[PDB]
Amino acid sequence: GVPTYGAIILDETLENVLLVQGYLAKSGWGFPKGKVNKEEAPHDCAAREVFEETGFDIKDYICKDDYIELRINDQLARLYIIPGIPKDTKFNPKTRREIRNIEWFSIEKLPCHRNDMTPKSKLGLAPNKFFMAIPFIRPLRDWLSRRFG
Numbered sequence: 198g199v200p201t202y203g204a205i206i207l208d209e210t211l212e213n214v215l216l217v218q219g220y221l222a223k224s225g226w227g228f229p230k231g232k233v234n235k236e237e238a239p240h241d242c243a244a245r246e247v248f249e250e251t252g253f254d255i256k257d258y259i260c261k262d263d264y265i266e267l268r269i270n271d272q273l274a275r276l277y278i279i280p281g282i283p284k285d286t287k288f289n290p291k292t293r294r295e296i297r298n299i300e301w302f303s304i305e306k307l308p309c310h311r312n313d314m315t316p317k318s319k320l321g322l323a324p325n326k327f328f329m330a331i332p333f334i335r336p337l338r339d340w341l342s343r344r345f346g
């Protein structure tokens with residue numbers, strides 16, 4: 198799998214993160230990210246993907262060592278952490294054929310795991326519209342604890 202790059206954008210309070218919702222297969226909510234182009238630097242891919250999906254340019258704010266990276270089914274996904282973006286920032290995707298909506302979400306109210314269906318005696322996880330974000334949420338909370346307190 199080809200690596201993906203993106204960002205976790207937080208507001209000034211550090212309470213809220215920016216998620217985007219796409220269409221069809223990508224119909225839930227997740228962090229803005231996408232597939233690296235051949236010969237493209239990770240920081241550049243992240244800024245480009247985030248710019249296309251939200252209209253907000255993170256290039257002046259990316260810090261090289263501040264990211265969270267997960268390998269999920271042998272695909273690397275790296276999200277650069279970008280704090281302090283004002284909640285009144287007007288976000289507008291370029292790619293409005295790909296992005297339905299863009300919203301702030303409270304970190305503390307997002308799930309950091311999906312629920313089972315053990316109150317139904319059935320194996321698996323119930324659907325959750327935050328499926329793509331979920332795996333970053335515990336690591337983000339642990340990273341904010343360390344970096345801030």
Ligand SMILES: CC(C)c1cc(C(=O)NCc2ccc(F)cc2)[nH]n1
Pocket residue numbers: 217218219220222223224225226227228229230250295296328329
């Ligand atoms: C595979 C299934 C579970 C899935 C994946 C996603 C998803 O990625 N949504 C967020 C998103 C959408 C468009 C975009 F350009 C960037 C991020 N939603 N459902």
